[PDB]
Structure 1
Amino acid sequence: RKPKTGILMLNMGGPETLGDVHDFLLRLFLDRDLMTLPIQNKLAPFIAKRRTPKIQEQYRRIGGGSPIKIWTSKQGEGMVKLLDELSPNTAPHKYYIGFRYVHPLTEEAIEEMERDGLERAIAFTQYPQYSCSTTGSSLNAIYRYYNQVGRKPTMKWSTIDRWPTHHLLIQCFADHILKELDHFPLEKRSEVVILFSAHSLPMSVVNRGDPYPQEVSATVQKVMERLEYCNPYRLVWQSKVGPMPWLGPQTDESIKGLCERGRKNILLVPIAFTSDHIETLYELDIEYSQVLAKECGVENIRRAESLNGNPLFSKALADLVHSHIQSNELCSKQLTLSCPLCVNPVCRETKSFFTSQQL
């Protein structure tokens, strides 16, 4: 039996091996939805080859590459098997992986989606919190596809563009946090500082009105509420890159700063990206961690697990697709509003694309 309802899972993806790094950065620095540079078509191929060594080193430090493709597939299969039982009417359900910077590319997934002749297609972002640089770009890619190809869609599109506070997403964070808290000495458990750490954004993106900072902040509050504020916490921002101003406090500074002030037990929480990724300076570079413990007497710096393959996550995914199908909405109301200082002509077009879909 042919597939009825297709679920396109959107993410930036990641280099499978250190060999895939160059082409990851290449596509990344070419993404005008993410950034605009002078003579970009020529500077991109450069910067990519230029930073490849550095990025290659960082991925080596965490296993040799990104496991996103595998976790997404395993999560997708778990979502589908549950979707076939939850909503018989829209079954069979089939999932497609739509990575932005590496194969299987977004356009490739759409292209294949068109061929299987689906009745309904769902652009399901894998970023719980919305940013024009993440979800925005993935959704813009879909619009850019049909327009670069020159023809209209042959299936009904809709989208789950954000889910910063989905009750089952919150339950998974709380569970992973409790699980890691148990790894600290029993007599220090209540002194542990929970440090929520999300990827920073350049202030120029924040200042034009990106909704990301506000949604990440909302996820954090729901998690602490579920945990009944058992420990103190802070929302900090990691991996800023370059010399320009980025939203702080930086995770690096915060850990050092916190240690210089007596807090020896820290629990980092990946609150805005659901799969493993590049870690922070004090977790990786061993030379810096020594100086740290030698002066501040750092006791424990731990990191909660990523929602990788927790089966309770698949239940979160399927529950979202199910609700979406039952509500008949084409996108959240937040998507109908562009950033106050948006200067990307494609944003409006992508918006209209989804609000204008049939059914």
Structure 2
Amino acid sequence: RKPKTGILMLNMGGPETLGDVHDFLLRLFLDRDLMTLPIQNKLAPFIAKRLTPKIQEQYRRIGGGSPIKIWTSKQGEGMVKLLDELSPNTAPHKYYIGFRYVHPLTEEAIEEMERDGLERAIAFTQYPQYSCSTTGSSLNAIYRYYNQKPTMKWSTIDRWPTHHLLIQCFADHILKELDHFPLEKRSEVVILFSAHSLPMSVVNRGDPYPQEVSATVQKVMERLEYCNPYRLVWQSKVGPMPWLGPQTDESIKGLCERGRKNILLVPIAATSDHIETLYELDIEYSQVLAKECGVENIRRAESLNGNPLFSKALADLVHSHIQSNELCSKQLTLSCPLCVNPVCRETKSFFTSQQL
């Protein structure tokens, strides 16, 4: 009857409609895990207002908002159905969405999980590769909510950059897209793995993300038996500060100018369609930039989205995590060597200290 085990699927989220953009921006400018601003309570509303039209326009260019919730729901639905057969002692399982900056907010889902009187809660990040500004920020909200005692037992699947069925899904979607290039151009295709960039100040303090993203790439390339040559590059840089690159836009253009005009783009750090793929790569870079460069064929591997094999990966991850009795990865128990955020430490002990 009643749900026994909740799986909290964590993601940043993105505005479902144009009307949701302002509040999405506002919550995010108010997050000190993400940025510290002078007179932040004053500037955040002000910044959210000045950015709103530009960002609304981007979502307009993709049909009016983000498909993130729909994909997350469908993936969660499939995960639960599998998990009830695979793990009948922890069943009935139930998935909750906890988005960081849009509705169902992390705090709302945790509230609902508590109401449902679950025996067990699992914090399951949907970022395979761990960043403190991504998964860490999501785990920080969970600790903060209880600080602002659980009545359920908590653990986290805080990273999974090389899960073997994640890797197969990526390899499968790549091979699928390679087949859409003209046959004569197939061997000539260069693969650009593309992940949201980070500011160097984040990279330089110890963030796990670039090294983990690199690991996902190697695994996909082994599985593909190095059929095409590749580079891992980074997108979504903003402002004048240095970020990790090489930049995805610059690389497409760089490569084109060097005679490599057939390019396959691979969103390697996300599991669903969102602004980064549908607007940034598909419109901003594939349509505009690439036309101006004389590109012959640019394409983008399909996001994992509703791949039934990705649901199987999710369930396998949850099932394995339940059998292992782990509370968090070994990696979580180590903070960035130059972490200056007092909460990271509290969030880690929140998980390592759980009864059970």
Deviations 1:50-91 (A, max 9, x none): 111111111122221111101111110100000000000000
Assess, with a 3 A threshold, how the Cα gap between structure 1 residues 287 and 98 changes in structure 2: closer, same or farther.
closer
Give the equivalent residue in structure 1 for 2:79.
79
Distance of 1:243 and 1:153 partners within structure 2: 43
Deviations 1:322-342 (A, max 9, x none): 000000000000000000110
Displacement of 1:297 in angstroms is 3.1
Deviations 1:262-317 (A, max 9, x none): 00100000100111122479977979878866775310111111001111100000
1:302-321 equivalences in 2 (<5 Å): 302-321=299-318
Most deviating of 323-332 and 286-295 = 286-295
Q: Tell me if 1:161 matches 2:158.
A: yes
Deviations 1:99-133 (A, max 9, x none): 00011000000011111101010000000000000
* 8 A Cα contact 1:8 1:124, kept in partner: yes
User: 3-state DSSP class of the match of 1:94?
Assistant: strand
Identity of aligned pairs, percent? 99
User: 3-state DSSP class of the match of 1:102?
Assistant: coil
Assess, with a 3 A threshold, how the Cα gap between structure 1 residues 289 and 223 changes in structure 2: closer, same or farther.
closer
* 8 A Cα contact 1:252 1:282, kept in partner: no
Q: Which runs of 5+ in 1 are unaligned?
A: none
Assess, with a 3 A threshold, how the Cα gap between structure 1 residues 233 and 288 changes in structure 2: closer, same or farther.
closer
User: 3-state DSSP class of the match of 2:132?
Assistant: coil
Assess, with a 3 A threshold, how the Cα gap between structure 1 residues 154 and 265 changes in structure 2: closer, same or farther.
same
User: 3-state DSSP class of the match of 2:143?
Assistant: helix
Most deviating of 90-99 and 42-51 = 42-51
Assess, with a 3 A threshold, how the Cα gap between structure 1 residues 64 and 358 changes in structure 2: closer, same or farther.
same
* 8 A Cα contact 1:79 1:315, kept in partner: yes
Distance of 1:78 and 1:288 partners within structure 2: 33
Assess, with a 3 A threshold, how the Cα gap between structure 1 residues 213 and 108 changes in structure 2: closer, same or farther.
same
Assess, with a 3 A threshold, how the Cα gap between structure 1 residues 119 and 231 changes in structure 2: closer, same or farther.
same
* 8 A Cα contact 2:13 2:69, kept in partner: yes
* 8 A Cα contact 1:239 1:280, kept in partner: no
Give the equivalent residue in structure 2 for 1:129.
129
User: 3-state DSSP class of the match of 2:310?
Assistant: helix
* 8 A Cα contact 2:62 2:278, kept in partner: no
* 8 A Cα contact 1:13 1:99, kept in partner: yes
Displacement of 1:197 in angstroms is 0.2
Distance of 1:281 and 1:157 partners within structure 2: 35
Deviations 1:230-250 (A, max 9, x none): 001000000101111110111
User: TM-score with structure 1 length normalisation?
Assistant: 0.96
User: 3-state DSSP class of the match of 2:10?
Assistant: strand
Q: Tell me if 1:181 matches 2:167.
A: no
User: TM-score with structure 2 length normalisation?
Assistant: 0.97
What stretches of structure 1 move > 4 A for 4+ residues in a row? 279-296
* 8 A Cα contact 2:8 2:122, kept in partner: yes
* 8 A Cα contact 2:267 2:277, kept in partner: no
User: 3-state DSSP class of the match of 2:274?
Assistant: coil
* 8 A Cα contact 1:281 1:288, kept in partner: no
* 8 A Cα contact 1:251 1:280, kept in partner: no
1:1-359 equivalences in 2 (<5 Å): 1-148=1-148, 152-279=149-276, 296-359=293-356
Assess, with a 3 A threshold, how the Cα gap between structure 1 residues 113 and 191 changes in structure 2: closer, same or farther.
same
Assess, with a 3 A threshold, how the Cα gap between structure 1 residues 80 and 244 changes in structure 2: closer, same or farther.
same
* 8 A Cα contact 1:259 1:296, kept in partner: yes
* 8 A Cα contact 1:262 1:296, kept in partner: no
RMSD: 1.8
Assess, with a 3 A threshold, how the Cα gap between structure 1 residues 290 and 95 changes in structure 2: closer, same or farther.
closer
* 8 A Cα contact 2:62 2:279, kept in partner: no
Assess, with a 3 A threshold, how the Cα gap between structure 1 residues 95 and 292 changes in structure 2: closer, same or farther.
closer
User: 3-state DSSP class of the match of 2:89?
Assistant: helix
Assess, with a 3 A threshold, how the Cα gap between structure 1 residues 288 and 118 changes in structure 2: closer, same or farther.
closer
